[PDB]
Amino acid sequence: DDDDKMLEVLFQGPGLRIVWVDEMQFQLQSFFDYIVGFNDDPVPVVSNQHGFSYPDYRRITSIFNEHCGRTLKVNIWSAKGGTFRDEYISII
Numbered sequence: 001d002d003d004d005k006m007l008e009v010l011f012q013g014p015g016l017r018i019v020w021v022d023e024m025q026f027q028l029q030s031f032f033d034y035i036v037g038f039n040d041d042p043v044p045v046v047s048n049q050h051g052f053s054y055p056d057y058r059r060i061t062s063i064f065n066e067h068c069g070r071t072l073k074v075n076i077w078s079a080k081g082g083t084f085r086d087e088y089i090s091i092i
């Protein structure tokens with residue numbers, strides 16, 4: 001049920017979300033890769049009084065800074081394919 005939990009957060013309502021964009025998605029809008037987790041935990045998100053959500057940026061700052069000088073695992077949900085995968089990014 002880790003998959004379901006990440007999607008619950010992603011779909012909870014209107015908001016800001018984080019996405020993964022490759023070099024060609026900007027030219028070719030045919031893949032829609034949402035970030036659903038970092039390091040196998042859901043993206044932490046704040047839901048306001050009006051039902052709009054945005055990331056818990058302080059918590060995300062801490063997650064990224066824990067990975068300074070090494071690789072962060074980014075959990076992706078591809079909207080069209082309906083599949084999960086993991087990408088890896090070097091954090092300076």
Ligand SMILES: [Cl-]
Pocket residue numbers: 088089090
């Ligand atoms: Cl990288």
